């Protein structure tokens, strides 16, 4: 229907308040430029042919090829896919990638599918959307219930149809390392987040080394943000959590042994010295850095006045709500907005694509140097925009992103003004 | 949505009269590719506006998808989808090596300048270029689009395609100077005259000196009367415009009637003719009745008063389903609309063949081919109706859906 | 490699009957392109198996190469090459704008499920895509491949090609739904009947009422018998198959004995006949003998016993070269195999023409055209044998090799 | 055939030192694509002559296939196939995003004029055009082909390609004026030197002032001696031609020796040197012995008489498998040929990278990148041999085949 999309358009309209943008250009940006819906037929293991529904949305490619993941999910809608493609346009523009925004999806429950039917689905998706994707057109990537395994299957099929005529590795990212993958992909989101957390404390004078962090969540993001916040920033991880509960212990938790416990015990609860707490105890925890590395709107109106960290680093997307926002800005709390804070992920995927189309692969250290600079410069631009335009960090991020996209459209002559 | 859900329902009905696997049904219910795109133009009043454009390609099992583009303020994706699905049956009933497609732009085009119209034509092609082509998807005129717009569209395609292929063949309905076909104007009527002749044959009637009534005196109606008289030797005893009808049991001459309508604004008072009503024309005792006008004009209410031996549905939809049941039980032979008026989609196929071949046919050549095509389509629908004991309408669908399904099975798309 | 070597040797004999430079001759002895590919499939049991496929394009001076794909466990690159070389002569004797190609996979298709067979067919097209296509190299069915597999292959090609061109025309022998041709299943037999009729004409023989015997009773034998009876007015006095022959001086009904064959496994012990042996069948006093089973059935041992006025070689290689001399001494007109049974490849050409022209022919259209290709091909070869005063078989090769060699010179491939 | 059978068996041996599924083993036993083409040229005679060319692409899982073209009168498809197969483990051991390819023409180039050689280089490209290209299959020089021939080939490609893409990147070993790379000429030696330096590091040997002998004195032997001295600061106590060796416990100067060899044809009687035999050179008590001439120079017969701490296999195939066991049991560290001489293919890579990126590197940049790749490659094969406790040759296959096999699984080519 829409409303994920309604929502995306709304936050674009809101940001048009903090910058001069023509109506022409605003209207153009509210429409995804190409939306494709295709039948994705596979033959089940039992011999029956099922047709699934797939989408690929290319929101805007003024700045270059569109970029974005493919989600396999039974509750997938075109409204979601469009909303997310719109957000991708801003996300890649906030870290100055020469990309537009794109996204895809199949309405499927993948855990009903065997490996073999999953490869069929991955290959049938590519055979269906082939004419609108490509290394210089639209470059997919993993997402919800897709992973490098499926990326490899999709790449191979693309290379088969293309007849090995071009950099087919660069048709898609998140690939296995054996076939065009990139080092640094797993750490990407956390690592970028950590750079922004660093440049934030820098801007704030906060010395950071030894100071406290709490990380709400323990997926890949949460675990690694905790790890690097520690072993890279000198912080004391005094709290983390998982879906079923969190733990505190202000002497210093160890993210690995906490992870062993988590996998050992299903949860970080009960941990060695871990004064078990609630998530909101974690959110209302007095730290230097709080990283809600889990779930949307967890700091809303009904808790925001009790958020204690000097810096809120949104590794998770959408943790802080607009009302939550205003409180925190006026509290004096510096949020690193999600799509700037976790852009390290889309940045390392740009790097993957660059290694592919150039036929030359970087090192673990080269990728991080490069990620460091992107994240650093991106944060600075948003930070100085929010200072100079005296607006909230989030709106600054949108003004940075939408200005790039707007400018590109103008320079092509897409909009005259 | 409603129009699309309607098209889906009509397939599920047709599936009641034939054996089709569930997996093939589920496939035919889903359009295989839908494309929605921004279509930006610069308006004359200086603004840049981005209209929403669609191209739907329902199924290409039999060949490239074929179908018109609508410029219309009420365009929904659901209408474009329904029309693509229906177009798959239309091209299959008359055995064209095509699947079904359709497009439209959501715009009120009524007051767009020629300049804005060309820009919109061109911007549409530039948006959908990657999914169309002489061997992929071949558009055509529809609501608010015409040959003029087809020419601008072709030209833009050729310019992007770099003249590397048969670009004329990317779209039909083109002006004659640039790859258009002869026989396009009279195609609907001429095709109908062939099925009327074949229906008569099926019924054992010789139409020479038999009586025909035609409801409607636009292009379709006028040429149906004119050709029935001319080719089939029939006596045009009634025709009618939107206002009313005229009658003369010794025959109206369709040209004179057209002349009269030109001068007087209506067929009314035509010298020697009895003024009758539309609904009276419908009930005349004639060998052929050709509703060439509005839809649902033969219904549950008047269907039992029809006296025609053959009812040629030249207009789309002129007979409702209750009326179907009645006319059948009365032994009245209906030529269902998408069979009867298929000469249109047939002659648009002919155009493509001419383009793709770089060689153009005469009037006589187009007519002879249209004859063959229409004649075999009638017999196929007729024999299916007899052999299966089903209404002519349901037989037309079983013939269409059977073709597409056979093609799907023969490609390995569905195993079953 | 004896199969290819045998092919080369035959080209070398034909050079003895015409003026052809060493240049050209050395060119024609080599296949211009030979592709050998890994064709992997995931078996039903999840295991992946790599099969070996070949595609061979012998010579494309005259146009794209044409030829079928054998799925057979003793396929060798040498046979494929031999067959490709021979295809070039076959497409040329009957004057197609083609050259010759052939392909094959080393697989026993009888051990693969339909799902595994579709995977194989698709893996083959995925493997050879870059060297085949509608104006490059056009495959077709052969040993253990059929229209079902052609449809699968055409489909995988269309998919990789992104429907940019006439993907129907990449391969012939397709199901009718997706571009196949009428006239296909009886093409070989029908082609032979035309050359039989022209041979009779050359001999001054009126075939109505005259006797024909046919060795072999598969599709070609069956339809050779049936069409000679019905079209030529002949009396079918004997037919046979692997298990034996049957004789009736008064005539056999081809459908009755086909029903008996289907019922009992062989034409043998048909109640409406006496049994005779295959050799006895070969020696009957008939106007036409049509060997339509296996190769080398007429040899040095029995060639003197043949009494047939015309030997129509429906099968490939039924007569040995010793037999050629003998029968030609005896005054027996042979219709050499690759001439006699060329109606198949002629009709496959017709199918490709319909595909690339997006326009399909009627049964009777495919027939008249076949009729003329075959007739014309026959008088060409017959008048060569007459003028150059040589064996029909050598006149056939001269005609073929001359065409291919003229095209090579006209391109400047060879300078003489 | 045999060369190929040898390669298959070397792979079958590899498999026993790692985990590799039978379906993956069988896949890897087979060249995925094999092209055999006619390659015609007009002689300066004016006569047209058709040569036989091959191009084999064994496996492209890791990326485009890389490998050279051989002009040689005893060229066999089995040979091109064996070398293509070997090419795949080479580009893998050194972690290039490539797979293995190889090509060949059966010709005596020595009998070909320069004009005719160009014609042949151009015809080869005209014939294999569809299966090669910057992202498909990138050739290189080999036996009797050189940068001069690459430039002709690249040019013909660029002409057929219509300059649509980075045509420089279709073929490596190019002249510097049209996309060639610096570092090319000394790439194999320079790479041998890095591996030698690292082998030393591994053994705790400082090579400064240690003795090296080098068998063979083409480019590879020459530059190995020259750099071992200049870079590694070794004493070159002996080098050797085909004629024989020369020795001097005090040192030979590689440049002097080459001058001398240039002025005389041979190294024999180099001032101050004692003439020794090649077998005497091999048995020299040195720190590094580099067989940079012919294959199977170290065998069962003489392997026990080898006194080098390091056998750097600069040539391909110098030590036999029996010899491998003897040397290893003796504590001698071999640097297996396809790891040790991989600097050539490593710089052909850097060339292709510069070509597709339209940006060229310096001598210094080429050399440091190579240093890094050859070093990193060495330690991997080294630590494999140590950790699996296997011969360095088998470790190099384990490293290489594991890479090619991991890419196949991640594409889903082989399921296990």
DSSP string, D74-91: T--HHHHHHHHHHHHHHH
Q: Quick one: tokens of C285?
A: 């006093």
C120 in Cβ contact with C38 (< 8 Å): no
D276 in Cβ contact with D297 (< 8 Å): no
Q: How far apart are CA A193 and CA A219, in angstroms?
A: 14
Q: b/e string for D135-163 if b means 16 or more Cβ within 10 A?
A: bbbbbbbbebbebbbbbbbbbbbbeebee
Interface contact A47-C160, CB threshold 8 A: no
Of the candidates B234, B229, B227, the residue with the CA atom closest to the CA atom of residue B367: B227
DSSP state letter for C307: -
Residue B41: helix, strand or coil by DSSP? Answer: strand
Using CB atoms, pick whichever of B35, B131, B414 lies closest to residue A49.
B414
Residue D41: helix, strand or coil by DSSP? Answer: strand
D to B contact (≥3 Cβ pairs closer than 8 Å): no
Q: Quick one: tokens of B113?
A: 């300048």
The torsion region of residue D233 among left (phi > 0), alpha (psi -120 to 50) and beta comes to left
Among chain A, residues having any CB pair with chain C shorter than 8 Å are 43, 47, 116, 127, 130-131, 160-161, 163
Residue D141 backbone phi and psi in degrees, to 5: -80, 165
Please report where in the chains the tokens 């004797």 appear, as a residue: C93
Burial class (CB in 10 A: 0-12, 13-18, 19+), C271: exposed
Q: How far apart are CA A303 and CA A320, in angstroms?
A: 11
C254 in Cβ contact with C231 (< 8 Å): no
A to C contact (≥3 Cβ pairs closer than 8 Å): yes
DSSP state letter for C230: I
Q: How far apart are CA B387 and CA A367, in angstroms?
A: 72
Indicate which residue of C66, C81, C90, C102 is catalytic.
C102
Among chain D, residues having any CB pair with chain C shorter than 8 Å are 23, 26-27, 30-38, 40, 42, 46-50, 52, 127, 130-131, 413-415
Q: How far apart are CA D180 and CA D201, in angstroms?
A: 33
Among chain A, residues having any CB pair with chain B shorter than 8 Å are 24, 27-28, 31-39, 41, 43, 47-51, 53, 128, 131-132, 414-416
> Beta partners for A245?
A242
Secondary structure element (H or E) that encloses residue D222, with its range: helix D219-230
Q: How far apart are CA A36 and CA A82, in angstroms?
A: 10
Residue B106: helix, strand or coil by DSSP? Answer: strand
C157 in Cβ contact with C333 (< 8 Å): no
Of the candidates D143, D134, D111, D139, the residue with the CA atom closest to the CA atom of residue D124: D139
Q: How far apart are CA A85 and CA D346, in angstroms?
A: 41
Q: How far apart are CA C45 and CA A266, in angstroms?
A: 36
Burial class (CB in 10 A: 0-12, 13-18, 19+), D16: exposed
Of the candidates C71, C36, C38, the residue with the CA atom closest to the CA atom of residue C54: C36
Helices (H), B15-56: 22-29
Angle, CA of C305, C306 and C311, to the nearest 5° = 165
Q: Quick one: tokens of D244?
A: 């024989």
A179: which chain D residues are within 8 Å (Cβ-Cβ)? Answer: 61-62, 407, 410-411
Task: Quote the minimal CA–CA distance from A408 to chain D in Å.
Answer: 25
- Rg, C-alpha atoms of chain A: 21
Closest-CA residue of chain A to B57: A38
Closest-CA residue of chain A to D403: A178
Residue C87 backbone phi and psi in degrees, to 5: -60, -40
A237 in Cβ contact with A255 (< 8 Å): yes
A161: which chain C residues are within 8 Å (Cβ-Cβ)? Answer: 159-160, 162
Which residues 6+ apart lie within 8 Å of C51 measured at CB?
C38, C39, C40, C41, C105, C106, C107, C120, C123
Residue C329 backbone phi and psi in degrees, to 5: -60, -45
- Biggest distance spanned by C-alpha atoms of chain D: 64
- As a whole number of Å, the end-to-end CA separation of chain D is 29
Please report where in the chains the tokens 């090296």 appear, as a residue: D212
Q: Which of D22, D38, D136, D413 to mutate to test the interface with C (most CBs of C within 10 A)?
A: D38
Residue A22: helix, strand or coil by DSSP? Answer: coil
B59 in Cβ contact with B18 (< 8 Å): no
Q: How far apart are CA D155 and CA C286, in angstroms?
A: 66
Closest-CA residue of chain B to C165: B135
Q: How far apart are CA C230 and CA C213, in angstroms?
A: 14
Q: How far apart are CA D231 and CA C409, in angstroms?
A: 60
D219 is known to lie in a ligand binding site = yes
Of the candidates C165, C190, C185, the residue with the CA atom closest to the CA atom of residue C175: C185
B36 in Cβ contact with B53 (< 8 Å): yes
Touching subunits of C (3+ CB pairs, under 8 Å) are A, B, D
Of the candidates B195, B197, B171, B175, the residue with the CA atom closest to the CA atom of residue B184: B175
Domains by residue range for chain A, with CATH: 34-179 (3.40.50.10860), 180-416 (3.40.50.720)
C283 in Cβ contact with C289 (< 8 Å): no
Q: How far apart are CA B294 and CA C145, in angstroms?
A: 53
Say what angle helices A188-204 and A220-231 make with each other, to 10 degrees: 50
Of the candidates C93, C70, C30, C165, the residue with the CA atom closest to the CA atom of residue C342: C93
Q: How far is CA C33 from CA D36, D58, D280, in A?
A: 6, 18, 50
Of the candidates B155, B67, B146, the residue with the CA atom closest to the CA atom of residue B114: B146
SS3 content of chain C, % helix, strand, coil (to 5): 50, 15, 35
E strands in D305-375: 310-312, 333-335
Secondary structure element (H or E) that encloses residue D35, with its range: strand D33-42
Torsion of CA B312, B315, B318, B319, to 10 degrees: 40
Alpha carbon D317 to chain centroid distance? 10
D191 in Cβ contact with D340 (< 8 Å): yes
C163: which chain B residues are within 8 Å (Cβ-Cβ)? Answer: 60, 64, 133, 135-136
Q: How far apart are CA A307 and CA A283, in angstroms?
A: 6
Q: How far apart are CA B107 and CA A374, in angstroms?
A: 43
Q: How far apart are CA D233 and CA D231, in angstroms?
A: 6
Of the candidates C155, C149, C286, C265, the residue with the CA atom closest to the CA atom of residue C214: C286
Which residues 6+ apart lie within 8 Å of A373 measured at CB?
none
State the resolution, in angstroms.
Answer: 2.2
Question: How many CA atoms does the CB half-sphere of A171 hold within 13 Å?
Answer: 26
Count each helix (H run) and each strand (E run) in chain A, helices first: 14, 13
Burial class (CB in 10 A: 0-12, 13-18, 19+), C176: middle
A74 in Cβ contact with A107 (< 8 Å): yes
* Active-site annotation holds for A103: yes
> Beta partners for B235?
B211
A163: which chain C residues are within 8 Å (Cβ-Cβ)? Answer: 129-130, 160
Closest-CA residue of chain A to C119: A43
Q: How far apart are CA B136 and CA C148, in angstroms?
A: 23
Helices (H), D231-336: 254-264, 278-282, 321-330
Q: Quick one: tokens of B10?
A: 């009509």
Using CB atoms, pick whichever of A28, A37, A132 lies closest to residue B50.
A28
Closest-CA residue of chain B to C353: B357
SS3 content of chain B, % helix, strand, coil (to 5): 50, 20, 35
Indicate which residue of A103, A175, A211, A227 is catalytic.
A103
Q: Please state whether beta strands D245-247 and D65-66 pair in parallel, antiparallel, or not at all (unpaired).
A: unpaired
Among chain B, residues having any CB pair with chain A shorter than 8 Å are 23, 26-27, 30-38, 40, 42, 46-50, 52, 127, 130-131, 413-416
Q: Quick one: tokens of D16?
A: 């026993």
Q: How far apart are CA D70 and CA D143, in angstroms?
A: 5
Burial class (CB in 10 A: 0-12, 13-18, 19+), C404: buried
């Amino acid at each position: 229907e829409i409303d994920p999309f309604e929502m995306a358009v709304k936050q674009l309209e809101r940001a048009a308040q903090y910058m001069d943008i023509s109506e022409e250009a605003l209207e153009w940006l509210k429409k995804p430029m190409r939306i494709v819906e295709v039948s994705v037929p596979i033959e089940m293991d039992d011999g029956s042919v099922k047709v699934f529904t797939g989408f690929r949305v290319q929101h805007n490619w003024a700045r270059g090829p569109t970029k974005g993941g493919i989600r396999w999910h039974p509750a997938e809608t075109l409204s979601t896919v469009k909303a997310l493609a719109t957000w991708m346009t801003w996300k890649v523009a906030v870290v100055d990638l020469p990309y537009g925004g794109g996204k895809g999806g199949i309405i499927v429950n993948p855990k009903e599918l065997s490996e073999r039917e999953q490869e069929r689905l991955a290959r049938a998706y590519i055979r269906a959307v082939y004419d609108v994707i490509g290394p210089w057109t639209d470059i997919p990537a993993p997402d919800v219930y897709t992973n490098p395994k499926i990326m490899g299957w999709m790449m191979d099929e693309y290379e088969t149809i293309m007849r090995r005529k071009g950099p087919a590795f660069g048709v898609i990212t998140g690939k296995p390392l054996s076939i065009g993958g990139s080092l640094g992909r797993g750490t990407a989101t956390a690592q970028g987040a950590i750079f922004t957390i660093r440049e934030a404390a820098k801007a704030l004078g906060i010395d950071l080394k030894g100071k406290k962090i709490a990380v709400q969540g323990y997926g890949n993001a949460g675990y690694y943000t905790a790890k690097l916040a520690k072993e890279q920033l000198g912080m004391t991880v005094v709290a983390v959590s998982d879906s079923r509960g969190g733990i505190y212990n202000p002497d210093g938790l160890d993210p690995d042994e906490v992870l062993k416990w988590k996998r050992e015990h299903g949860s970080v609860k009960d941990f060695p010295g871990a004064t078990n707490i609630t998530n909101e105890e974690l959110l209302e925890l007095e730290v230097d850095v709080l990283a809600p590395a889990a779930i949307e709107e967890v700091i809303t109106e009904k808790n925001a006045d009790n958020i204690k960290a000097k810096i809120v680093a949104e590794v998770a997307n959408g943790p802080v709500t607009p009302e939550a926002d205003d409180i925190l800005r006026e509290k004096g709390i510096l949020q690193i907005p999600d799509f700037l804070c976790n852009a390290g992920g889309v940045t390392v995927s740009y790097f993957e694509w660059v290694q592919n189309i150039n036929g030359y692969y970087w090192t673990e250290e080269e990728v991080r140097e490069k990620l460091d600079k992107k994240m650093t410069k991106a944060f600075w631009e948003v930070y100085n925009t929010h200072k100079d335009k005296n607006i909230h960090m989030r709106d600054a991020a949108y003004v940075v992103a939408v200005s790039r996209v707007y400018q590109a459209m103008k320079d092509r002559g897409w909009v005259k003004k």
